[PDB]
Structure 1
Amino acid sequence: KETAAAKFERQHMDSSTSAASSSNYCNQMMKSRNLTKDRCKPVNTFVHESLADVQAVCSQKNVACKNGQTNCYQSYSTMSITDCRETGSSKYPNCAYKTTQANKHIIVACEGNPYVPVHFDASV
């Protein structure tokens, strides 16, 4: 709500493009969202759907988190997703990514207040 909803939006949201067809997306994005900062994560998923669209999921199909469970919700249909996948070997500022584009469904956890997604569980 104050750091979680921001945390999620930081990592997973990109509602400015309907998609992403190129490794350029991933490389710029990870950098942009300073996701390479200090230590760039191996793999990250960006949702190309309006933030509202994503919040909406908080009141869709109720599932089981890959941990505790419910408070986990699954997207009815298919979401425009972009997968960012590390590539460039070495453990330093050397971070390159490949841009894989899918159309999968999302599993999100939601801290309502109104509703705000805070943790992006599995991407299908």
Structure 2
Amino acid sequence: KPKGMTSSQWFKIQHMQPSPQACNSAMKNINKHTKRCKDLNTFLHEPFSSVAATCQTPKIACKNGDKNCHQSHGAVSLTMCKLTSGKHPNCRYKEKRQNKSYVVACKPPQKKDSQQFHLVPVHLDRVL
């Protein structure tokens, strides 16, 4: 993740998009912090409080075996942004808008986090 960023702010910047936006504009806020074009990225069309609430679901196993994953109560509007062409930072994307559930790994916020929910998302483990 970018150096100096809190885990949940990187999560916010990569997966929080309540107001849907075109992939090719939105992906620039991600790739300005990366060295190569991100190949696949999912934007969740929900505010941060409702993903924070997902962290209050029962603990489930993440893909990597951790036990801090949480599934959403239901499906939400979301956009997948798959890379198709370009050399970084001129990344070009094709979009796919679906309605699906998701799974997030959560932990307590850090001291610098502006929204102190008792558990915040820090990675998107799945799109079911």
**Of the candidates 52, 57, 62, which is equivalent to residue 59 of structure 2?**
62
What does residue 106 of structure 1 align with?
102
**Of the candidates 25, 28, 47, which is equivalent to residue 28 of structure 1?**
25
Unmatched 5+ stretches in structure 2: 110-117
Determine the C-alpha separation between the residues in 1 that align with 2:59 and 2:42: 21
Q: Provide the TM-score with structure 1 as the length reference.
A: 0.83
Counterpart secondary structure, 1:41: coil
Q: Which has the higher contact order (CA 8 A, sep 6+)?
A: 1
Letter in 1 for 2:98: A
What does residue 121 of structure 2 align with?
117
Native 8 Å contact 1:61 1:75 kept in 2: no
**Of the candidates 16, 27, 46, which is equivalent to residue 13 of structure 1?**
16
Letter in 1 for 2:123: H
User: How many residues are matched?
Assistant: 115
What does residue 76 of structure 1 align with?
73
Unmatched 5+ stretches in structure 1: none
**Of the candidates 39, 43, 46, which is equivalent to residue 36 of structure 2?**
39
Alpha-carbon RMSD across the aligned residues, in angstroms, is 1.8
Letter in 2 for 1:123: V
- How far does the alpha carbon of each residue in 1:51-97 deviate from its partner, in whole angstroms, 9 at most, with x for none? 10111000114321001232100001011111001112x55444210
Native 8 Å contact 2:14 2:30 kept in 1: no
What does residue 4 of structure 1 align with?
7
Native 8 Å contact 1:108 1:119 kept in 2: yes
Determine the C-alpha separation between the residues in 2 that align with 1:41 and 1:72: 23
Give the direction of change, closer, same or farther, for the CA distance of 1:104–1:61 in structure 2 (3 Å limit).
farther
Determine the C-alpha separation between the residues in 2 that align with 1:79 and 1:101: 11
Counterpart secondary structure, 1:11: helix
